[PDB]
């Protein structure tokens, strides 16, 4: 049970020169792990087979060394269609550890997310629940907050966040924390602010409104 | 090419197994020891068990030695892997991949390259069910905000997916689809997909086509102002 | 409109310096227990096909010399 630890956590680029990335086993491997290209959603593929010589139609520059602990892995020119996961993987010890994950971003620049609070319906008033949505929307990076107020009372645990992929597009991000209530306990108050906290804004973003107001 | 099918996607309540055919393809069979591995979205990979393909070489992983068995179909080159007493922490994409077999007379591999799509597998007590879409859809016009977005609100259905398209996918600007982010109360995962429109587009209505089918349920909504 | 807690008599309420007199009935000043401020109003029935029209009543009680002009919209 050799322990994979990659040392970058994750990364982001905005496309460009070497991407180098980094893999150490807990002993001594010697050459005899591979690397791979888990993209979202799809099967992982192999990049590198045993710690380099570019397995079977990789195109011109993922090389890679090693041998034999702290493993290395190069995205030398970095063509921005391989931000995927990657992983290091040992194989000649059972039982077989893979690494950690190694999500790869783009690095446009920090940006505010356009903070949006919807209202429960009605027709969720017509289930017996609640459920207030914030938005957060068009940002980056993922490094944000979110500070639930039940006229102004900090809440949180009947929260559901939920976090969109990177943006082939424009590279941004999208939030939405879910505040699933009772109705009861929606009834019990009005004042529904969302207080979101995102480097690209300036402010701890309070986004509100009244229950009936909408 | 040296390929697998694997088939196919089900999800088991705590029950019985979800064994996988792992159809091989392209390449002989009796020189290649298929493994599988198991990941769990969001997280990392779980190699869990390699036959060798022929004389079998079980090599289960540890903390389920056990629970899983592993078969071989040498006859049409599919594999097989089962689960016993089946659990919630078998929310995993079942890949099957091939090690190479650690004989004398197979080729040198270990890097798996056959490798296998995946294989939606959640370990799931919910019921299948419809989304509960709540929506806002306003007219971008809520306090005074130029573009003021909307979105639905797609929740508790099981199993996955919803499929979301707004106004039959005519507004593809601003689609953010959030994930299923599942629910610890029932087990029906949440989503919703938004977009930003602009006030001025407060005369259009814009309809997301919730629809899932493998509850085979249809939803389309849109919601206004209040006067 | 809700003419509340003037002393003493009386308001004189107008709809737009007059100019609604349709509609108009003054309800007399109902006289506060609590504080000896009594409550008048003055109101119109108008139809639907005026909405894009603000109704000012022109409330001006002379004996504290305030004069009070107002309108409220819909909540979008």
């Known amino acids: 049970e050799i322990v994979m630890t990659q040392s970058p956590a994750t990364l982001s680029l905005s496309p460009g020169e070497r991407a180098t990335l980094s893999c150490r086993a807990s002993?001594?491997?010697?050459?005899?792990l591979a690397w791979y290209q888990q993209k979202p959603g799809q099967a992982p593929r192999l990049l590198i087979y045993?710690?380099?010589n570019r397995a079977t139609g990789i195109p011109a520059r993922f090389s890679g060394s090693g041998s034999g602990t702290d493993f290395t892995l190069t995205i030398s020119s970095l063509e921005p269609e391989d931000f995927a996961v990657y992983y290091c993987?040992?194989?000649?010890?059972?039982?077989?550890?893979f690494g950690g994950g190694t999500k790869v971003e783009i690095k446009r620049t920090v940006a505010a997310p356009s903070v949006f609070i919807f209202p429960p319906s009605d027709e969720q008033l017509k289930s017996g629940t609640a459920s207030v949505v914030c938005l957060l929307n068009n940002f980056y990076p993922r490094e944000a907050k979110v500070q639930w107020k039940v006229d102004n009372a900090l809440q949180s645990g009947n929260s559901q966040e939920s976090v969109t992929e990177q943006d082939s597009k424009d590279s941004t991000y999208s939030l939405s924390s879910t505040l699933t209530l009772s109705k009861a306990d929606y009834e019990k108050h009005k004042v529904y602010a969302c207080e979101v906290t995102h480097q690209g804004l300036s402010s701890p973003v309070t986004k509100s409104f009244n229950r009936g107001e909408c | 090419e040296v390929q697998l099918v694997q088939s196919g996607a089900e999800v088991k309540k705590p029950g019985a197994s979800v064994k996988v055919s792992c159809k091989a393809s392209?390449?002989?069979?009796?020189?290649?020891?298929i493994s599988w591995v198991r990941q769990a979205p969001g997280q990392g990979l779980e190699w869990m068990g390699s036959?060798?393909?022929?004389?079998?070489?079980?090599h289960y992983a540890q903390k389920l030695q056990g629970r899983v068995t592993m078969t071989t179909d040498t006859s049409t080159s599919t594999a097989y892997m089962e689960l016993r007493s089946l659990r919630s922490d078998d929310t995993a994409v079942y890949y099957c991949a091939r090690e190479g077999a650690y004989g004398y007379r197979s080729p040198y591999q270990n890097w798996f390259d056959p490798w296998g799509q995946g294989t939606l597998v959640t370990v799931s007590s919910a019921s299948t069910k419809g989304p509960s879409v709540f929506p806002l859809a306003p007219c971008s016009r809520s306090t005074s905000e130029s573009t003021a977005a909307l979105g639905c609100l797609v929740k508790d259905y099981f199993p996955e997916p919803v499929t979301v398209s707004w106004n039959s996918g005519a507004l593809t600007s601003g689609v953010h689809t959030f994930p299923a982010v599942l629910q610890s109360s029932g087990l029906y995962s949440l989503s919703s997909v938004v977009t930003v429109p602009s006030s001025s587009l407060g005369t259009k209505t814009y309809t997301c086509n919730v629809d899932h089918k493998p509850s085979n349920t249809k939803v389309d909504k849109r919601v206004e102002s209040k006067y | 409109?809700?003419?509340?807690?003037?002393?003493?008599?009386?308001?004189?309420?107008?709809?737009?310096?007059?100019?609604?007199?349709?509609?108009?009935?003054?309800?007399?000043?109902?006289?506060?227990?609590?504080?000896?401020?009594?409550?008048?109003?003055?109101?119109?029935?108008?139809?639907?096909?005026?909405?894009?029209?603000?109704?000012?009543?022109?409330?001006?009680?002379?004996?504290?010399?305030?004069?009070?002009?107002?309108?409220?919209?819909?909540?979008?």
């Open positions: 002993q001594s491997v010697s050459s005899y």
């Open positions: 392209g390449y002989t069979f009796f020189k290649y020891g």
């Open positions: 045993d710690a380099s």
């Open positions: 993987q040992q194989h000649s010890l059972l039982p077989r550890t």
């Open positions: 036959i060798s393909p022929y004389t079998g070489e079980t």
